Amino acid sequence: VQKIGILGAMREEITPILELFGVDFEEIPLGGNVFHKGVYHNKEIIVAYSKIGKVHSTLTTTSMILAFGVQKVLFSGVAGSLVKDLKINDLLVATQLVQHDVDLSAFDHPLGFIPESAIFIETSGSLNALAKKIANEQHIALKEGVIASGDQFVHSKERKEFLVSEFKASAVEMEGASVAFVCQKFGVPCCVLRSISDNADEKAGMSFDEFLEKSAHTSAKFLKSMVDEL
Amino acid sequence: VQKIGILGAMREEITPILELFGVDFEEIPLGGNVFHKGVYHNKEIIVAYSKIGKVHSTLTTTSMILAFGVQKVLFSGVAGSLVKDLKINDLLVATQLVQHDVDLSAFDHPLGFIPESAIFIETSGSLNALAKKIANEQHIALKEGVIASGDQFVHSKERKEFLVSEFKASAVEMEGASVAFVCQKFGVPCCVLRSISDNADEKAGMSFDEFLEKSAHTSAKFLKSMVDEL
Ligand SMILES: Nc1ncnc2c(CN3C[C@H](CSc4cnccn4)[C@@H](O)C3)c[nH]c12
Ligand SMILES: Nc1ncnc2c(CN3C[C@H](CSc4cnccn4)[C@@H](O)C3)c[nH]c12
Numbered sequence: 001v002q003k004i005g006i007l008g009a010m011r012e013e014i015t016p017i018l019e020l021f022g023v024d025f026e027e028i029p030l031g032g033n034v035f036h037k038g039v040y041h042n043k044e045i046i047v048a049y050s051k052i053g054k055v056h057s058t059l060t061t062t063s064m065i066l067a068f069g070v071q072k073v074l075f076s077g078v079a080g081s082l083v084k085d086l087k088i089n090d091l092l093v094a095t096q097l098v099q100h101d102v103d104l105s106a107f108d109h110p111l112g113f114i115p116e117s118a119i120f121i122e123t124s125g126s127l128n129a130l131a132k133k134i135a136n137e138q139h140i141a142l143k144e145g146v147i148a149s150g151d152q153f154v155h156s157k158e159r160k161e162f163l164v165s166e167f168k169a170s171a172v173e174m175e176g177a178s179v180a181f182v183c184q185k186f187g188v189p190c191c192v193l194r195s196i197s198d199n200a201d202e203k204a205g206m207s208f209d210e211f212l213e214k215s216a217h218t219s220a221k222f223l224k225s226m227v228d229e230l
Numbered sequence: 231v232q233k234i235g236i237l238g239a240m241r242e243e244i245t246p247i248l249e250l251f252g253v254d255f256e257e258i259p260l261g262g263n264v265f266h267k268g269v270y271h272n273k274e275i276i277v278a279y280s281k282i283g284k285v286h287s288t289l290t291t292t293s294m295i296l297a298f299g300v301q302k303v304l305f306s307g308v309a310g311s312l313v314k315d316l317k318i319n320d321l322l323v324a325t326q327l328v329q330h331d332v333d334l335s336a337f338d339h340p341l342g343f344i345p346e347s348a349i350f351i352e353t354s355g356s357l358n359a360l361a362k363k364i365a366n367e368q369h370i371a372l373k374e375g376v377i378a379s380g381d382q383f384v385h386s387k388e389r390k391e392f393l394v395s396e397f398k399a400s401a402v403e404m405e406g407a408s409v410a411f412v413c414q415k416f417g418v419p420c421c422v423l424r425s426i427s428d429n430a431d432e433k434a435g436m437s438f439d440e441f442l443e444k445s446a447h448t449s450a451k452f453l454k455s456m457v458d459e460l
Contacts, residue, residue, distance in 0.1 A: 031292070032415040052344050053332060054381075055408050058288040059415065062261070066296045101331060102283060103382040106435045114282050151284075151381070152333040178285050185262040185289065205336045 001042070004227065005070035008049045009057060009175045012212055013077035016220035017047055021227075030067055033060050037068075041228065046070055050175060053151045054099070057175035061182040072127070072230075075179050075192045076223040078208070078215040079147065079171040080200030082160050086170060087196060088211055089218050092143035093131045094192040096120040097177035098167045101150030111166055119167075120146070121180045127191035127226070134225050145170030147192060149177035155204035163200075172200050191226070195219040231272070234457065235300035238279045239287060239405045242442055243307035246450035247277055251457075260297055263290050267298075271458065276300055280405060283381045284329070287405035291412040302357070302460075305409050305422045306453040308438070308445040309377065309401040310430030312390050316400060317426060318441055319448050322373035323361045324422040326350040327407035328397045331380030341396055349397075350376070351410045357421035357456070364455050375400030377422060379407035385434035393430075402430050421456070425449040 008014040018025065018036060025036035025047070036047040046068050050060035064070045079092075086092060098112045098120055105111060112119040128144060135142035148169035154160065163169045176192040183190035195215040198207030238244040248255065248266060255266035255277070266277040276298050280290035294300045309322075316322060328342045328350055335341060342349040358374060365372035378399035384390065393399045406422040413420035425445040428437030 031412075051346050052334070055284055055288050055329065055411055056344070056347070058285050058408075059292055059412055062289055062292040063296065066293065099285065099381065101381055104282070106383045106385045114286070116281050117286070151329065151331055153336045155336045178288075181285055182261075182289055 003044045003046065003068065003070045004230065005064040005068065005073040006045055006047045006223065007060065007073060007075045007179060008077045009052050010077065011049050013216045014047055014049045016217040017076060017223065020220055020224045021045065031059055031063050033063065035068065043230065045227065053174045054149065054178040057178040058182055061179045065182065065186050065188055070188065072189045073179060073183050074223055074226065075176060076219040077173070077194060078197035078212060078219065079173040079194035080154055080198050080204055081171055081196045082164055082200055083170050086143055089215055090141060090143065090196045091218065091222055092145060092171055092194055093128050094123055094147040094176055095128065095144045096122055097147050097149055097180045097192065098169065099150060099177045100148035100163055100167060100169070101152060121177055121184055123180050124189035124191055127189055130226060130229060131191065131193065134229060138225070143170060147176045147194065148172045149174055153204070154200045155202055157201055160200050171196065193219055193223055233274045233276065233298065233300045234460065235294040235298065235303040236275055236277045236453065237290065237303060237305045237409060238307045239282050240307065241279050243446045244277055244279045246447040247306060247453065250450055250454045251275065261289055261293050263293065265298065273460065275457065283404045284379065284408040287408040288412055291409045295412065295416050295418055300418065302419045303409060303413050304453055304456065305406060306449040307403070307424060308427035308442060308449065309403040309424035310384055310428050310434055311401055311426045312394055312430055313400050316373055319445055320371060320373065320426045321448065321452055322375060322401055322424055323358050324353055324377040324406055325358065325374045326352055327377050327379055327410045327422065328399065329380060329407045330378035330393055330397060330399070331382060351407055351414055353410050354419035354421055357419055360456060360459060361421065361423065364459060368455070373400060377406045377424065378402045379404055383434070384430045385432055387431055390430050401426065423449055423453055
């Protein structure tokens, strides 16, 4: 009855999700994505990785809604930390997201702003509150804050400082804003969950390669614990 | 029978299109866009502006295909020139497009490249050849070349030089690559047509404000002349 879309960006972000749910899936190709459709605890779960970045994630989210009729979207994967209290493996949910690389300042628009839109995109308060409930019950830390998304891998102190000063972001990645954006356009509740893989600095490539697997698994496991209470 | 999607980014890019076709339209809202559906010369034409930038244009193109079933997409609007021979009001069609702001160089990927994708996206050779045919019949100039798209308005000599050296782009805008990308994923022929509004330099804001209306109309008129031969 209930249909839940579950997204990662990279194949590595959904491999643990498919394993952890542990049910059979049917593969359905559409728009260059493969959607894994299964039944888990009397819900239909549609799992896919978008591929990296904003165009890829916008397309896949739109397909999930328009073609598969999902009623909620939960995103799971990894992110770069922009704040000292978010360390490798730590979890956060995005309260709001921003497209940090949007620049129409030539027309005196604030950075991140596009006409007929807004700088910040909201996610589901209800899903975020569920996440918080669960993390307290499991005795694990969970931050809530702003996630910045853009089409560059961030690995420089200069760009971190910009994201912190301009948007007060807590983490950076490349898909969350686009997924939340599409969901809000269609009135679909959305939760964006990330586990820290790196510190978005000059060492980020190294850290990301080291921690992608573990951080993705941490996010996946948490996402499943959310689905278990929906 | 035949269904043709017609896109602009800004309302100003489609105002002349609706006027020039000169038929009645029904308005259908979906995903935060308004789609104008009409019949012209025994074709169904679905006209919309996406709103600015890559997420907006990806969403709208995806909706056109998945929700409205369009069989071809023609994009019309304005662009910044990166080459001396493309002057204000001149027309070009994109032979290929690139997302110029994509940077995964931290993992030794070439600029513009995303794993499981490609730097350059192709458009319909057939539609481009039609455009060329028509422009010769009308005795108007039409260039064919690479268009670079990203989520920044380009207005600096440094960024122009980069687009020319890195991608050999002839023009810059903020939507074309995303529209062509979605179309290719779904096997839908796509043509991206632009009229020059500015030179993508420090004076670009000024020039754009001056020439948006005329350049949009020039593009719209040409697009209609294409539809008249489909
Ligand atoms: N510092 C950071 N900046 C921007 N994004 C991130 C992320 C999250 N994901 C990982 C991946 C990096 S690109 C990639 C990965 N592997 C191969 C090629 N490209 C992209 O999907 C966004 C983690 N840390 C980040
Ligand atoms: N130099 C350039 N760089 C990048 N893009 C362009 C374009 C084409 N369009 C116009 C518009 C500019 S932003 C906008 C316009 N008006 C108000 C707010 N933002 C965006 O839709 C892309 C023309 N010249 C360009």
